[PDB]
């Protein structure tokens, strides 16, 4: 399926790309485009360079706000699969040091610059966004991004879609800490009523609660 753009709020757009992975077939991955004054910033690549180049072109030609910089929410190919495209298209890329290290271990290109959030609960302000490291969950390095004007929380792959009980790709997950990481994000951003998972539809805070439940160690 081709690459789709949907408006989530004032100056906040979701990009969605698809990849066919047998046996189940097409799987979506979502990220964001965030408008700033006369440029935009990007949260996550799509699956590959071609899809990522389509996102850059859309921001330049449709929003008229070319992508200047990007952040990447963990070291997997749905979030960093299009790094060569971003680099060739002049986008200045950012990730945590741990994400960059895991990217190299996993055969992905690291970002060009470092987000200094290494402790659990650490937050910074980057291009009008709040970036939090809530601890390991879907991947040890996963970060979340909050946009405080529209109160949109981008949970990425740490937040599971809808009412699923499937945990998704758990190859790199911290099964012990994931539910606490979700609680940490939910407590850090109480005003965000719109929550974006990477692999499903935009939703509300019910997907925070559901994710924390389905990934929580039980008695």
Contacts (Cβ under 8 Å, ≥6 apart) of 88: none
Of 179, 194, 201, 202, the residue at the interface with a copy of itself (CB under 8 A) is 179
Residue burial 156-166, b: 16+ Cβ < 10 Å; e: rest: bbbbbbeeeee
Q: Give the nearest distance from C-beta 214 to a copy of itself in angstroms.
A: 7
Q: Structure tokens of 95?
A: 């990730």
* Residue 138 CA, distance from chain mean position: 12
- Picked from a copy of itself, Cl ion, Zn ion, none, the partner binding residue 201 (CB below 5 to 8 A depending on kind) is Cl ion
- Picked from Cl ion, a copy of itself, Zn ion, none, the partner binding residue 166 (CB below 5 to 8 A depending on kind) is a copy of itself
Q: Does 150 count as an annotated binding residue?
A: no
> How far apart are alpha carbons 18 and 50 in whole angstroms?
12
Return the number of the residue (128 or 217) whose C-beta is nearest a copy of itself: 217
Q: Does 72 count as an annotated binding residue?
A: no
Tracing tokens 């758990």 back to the chain, one arrives at 170
Q: Which H or E run includes 213?
A: helix 206-214
Greatest C-alpha distance within the chain = 53
Return the number of the residue (105 or 206) whose C-beta is nearest a copy of itself: 206
Q: Is 135 in the site for Cl ion (CB under 5 A)?
A: no
Return the number of the residue (117 or 158) whose C-beta is nearest Zn ion: 158
Strand order in the sheet with 12-21: 4-9, 12-21, 25-35, 40-43, 67-71, 92-96, 113-115
Name the segment binding Zn ion (CB under 5 A); options: 111-119, 127-135, 157-165, 202-210: 157-165
Residue 207 DSSP SS3: helix
Q: Does 76 count as an annotated binding residue?
A: yes
Q: Structure tokens of 193?
A: 């009523």
Return the number of the residue (62 or 187) whose C-beta is nearest a copy of itself: 187
Q: Does 15 count as an annotated binding residue?
A: no
Q: Structure tokens of 123?
A: 């937050």
Return the number of the residue (162 or 204) whose C-beta is nearest Cl ion: 162
> By CB under 8 A, what part of segment 8-67 binds a copy of itself?
20, 22-26
* CB-CB contact of 31 with 44 (8 Å): yes
Residues lying near Zn ion in the complex (CB under 5 A):
76, 78, 157, 198
The residue ranges that bind a copy of itself (CB under 8 A) are 20, 22-26, 162-167, 170, 175-177, 179-180, 183, 186-187, 190, 193, 205-206, 208-210, 213-214, 217-219
């Amino acid at each position: 399926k081709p690459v789709e753009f949907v408006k989530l709020g004032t100056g906040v757009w979701m990009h969605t790309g698809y990849k066919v992975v047998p046996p189940w077939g097409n799987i979506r991955t979502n990220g964001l485009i965030i408008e700033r004054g006369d440029y935009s910033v990007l949260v996550d690549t799509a699956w590959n360079d071609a899809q990522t180049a389509e996102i850059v072109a859309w921001a330049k030609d449709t929003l008229q706000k070319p992508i200047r910089a990007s952040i990447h929410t963990h070291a997997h190919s749905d979030k960093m699969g299009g790094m060569d495209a971003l680099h060739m298209l002049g986008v200045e890329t950012f990730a945590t040091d741990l994400t960059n290290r895991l990217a190299i271990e996993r055969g992905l290109m690291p970002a060009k610059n470092v987000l200094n959030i290494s402790e659990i609960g650490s937050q910074i302000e980057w291009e009008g966004l709040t970036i939090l490291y809530p601890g390991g969950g879907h991947s040890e390095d996963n970060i979340v991004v909050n946009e405080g004007v529209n109160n949109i929380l981008f949970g990425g792959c740490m937040i599971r879609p809808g009412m699923t009980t499937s945990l998704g790709n758990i190859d790199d997950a911290n099964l012990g800490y994931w539910s606490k990481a979700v609680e940490n994000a939910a407590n850090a951003f109480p005003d965000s009523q719109i929550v974006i998972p990477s692999h499903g539809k935009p939703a509300g805070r019910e997907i925070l609660k559901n994710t924390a439940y389905i990934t929580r160690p039980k008695l």
